[PDB]
Amino acid sequence: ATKSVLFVCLGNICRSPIAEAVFRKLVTDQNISENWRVDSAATSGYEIGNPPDYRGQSCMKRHGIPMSHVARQITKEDFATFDYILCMDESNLRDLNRKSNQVKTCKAKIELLGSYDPQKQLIIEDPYYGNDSDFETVYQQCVRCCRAFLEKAH
């Protein structure tokens, strides 16, 4: 379009780097990655500079999905440049809305990624203190939500 989407979670080391990687693969598989700007960022500064939690890498390797990212915090600019900001839970959503009201230009539509899930699992829960099966759940949620978002944005 070019179209753009920013996936957001608390740390940008587990949920949103997986979502970003899943989405980039989907558009690359459909020959339209050049039409999309895809990224991920954190609401917080807890993990800035760090790559995805290696448990998430292990999950993505199993599914054949390339993932390469260094954590960064969302900035005021992101609200002006992204068409969609898709986040994981209600705390992310609250924080993003708070930040968005501090800027003059907010192009982005800010929503829960789970609002796209055909299976209606609204919240994508933080797997950091969970186990490998929690990362797998997060992955599967991202696949379903990302596919539906690409098909038709709200």
Q: How far is the CB of 83 from ligand OIF (least distance, A)?
A: 22
Whether 126 sits among the annotated catalytic residues: the reply is: yes
Helices and strands (H, E) in the chain, number of each type:
5, 4
When asked if residue 46 is in the footprint of ligand OIF (CB under 6 A), the reply is yes
Q: Report yes or no: 79 and 106 within 8 Å, Cβ to Cβ.
A: yes
- HEC assignment per residue over 35-49: HEEEEEEECCCCCCC
**Which of 5, 6, 12, 141: binder of ligand OIF (CB under 6 A)?**
12
What is the distance between the alpha carbons of residues 7 and 84, in angstroms, rounded to a whole number?
Answer: 8
When asked if residue 126 is in the footprint of ligand OIF (CB under 6 A), the reply is yes
Whether 15 sits among the annotated catalytic residues: the reply is: yes
Indicate the residue among 15 and 24 with the shorter CB distance to ligand OIF: 15
When asked if residue 108 is in the footprint of ligand OIF (CB under 6 A), the reply is no
Catalytic residue ranges:
9, 15, 126
